[PDB]
Amino acid sequence: SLLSVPHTESVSLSTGSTVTIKGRPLVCFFNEPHLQVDFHTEMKEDSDIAFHFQVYFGNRVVMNSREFKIWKEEVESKNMPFQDGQEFELSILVLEDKYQVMVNGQAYYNFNHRIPVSSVKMVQVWRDISLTKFNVSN
């Protein structure tokens, strides 16, 4: 059963929380589908973003924050553990110092907190994926 995409949910996070996302790119990597995961400070979609995580499948990853409506310093990664045409499991671990993004059980990306974790109140998952699982740990 497919979940809504764009997927928008209320959340509350603290140290030790995990946000788990299972989905599949809509097209082959040759045509560069994207995935975007945004940790927002409010339910409103124009609210600030504590953690912006954008995958250009088969290419690269960009991470950033949007603070008082302004995008801040871009962080890039060339790590690309995602498999063309395959389902992926993203686990975003909320550590004391950073978000850590696991792909299929191993950490490949890290983003030190710029906005306090306790300011996060919504997560939106969108771009060119289908979604079968979105779980915030209890």
Add this chain to the structure above:
Amino acid sequence: SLLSVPHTESVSLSTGSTVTIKGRPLVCFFNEPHLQVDFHTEMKEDSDIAFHFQVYFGNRVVMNSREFKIWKEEVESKNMPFQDGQEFELSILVLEDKYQVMVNGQAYYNFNHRIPVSSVKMVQVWRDISLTKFNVSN
């Protein structure tokens, strides 16, 4: 009634053809939804692209071709006639020398042919839009 997105259709184009697309961005422009329209040489999604048209809503437009699997020279435009939160009507006119992209009835983008028009056999419309109309002129 919403059409499938990614939307993929067989087409045949010649001078005077129009490809009309009516849709709406899935999110507000502040979060930069995208639209991508690719004129392909075969039904296979990894086939060459005679006309690649990518809108970064509220930002800019990029156009290109993919020839023998290689992306060629990028063409950029800062024209941004699209309206935040509004339905748009794209009409892509196939002229003898170029594709001309109309937004709501006026031409804002042009792309001189790099691949012959008669090589185009499929069109794919995707990224962050819903779709209510896709019509190739008879």
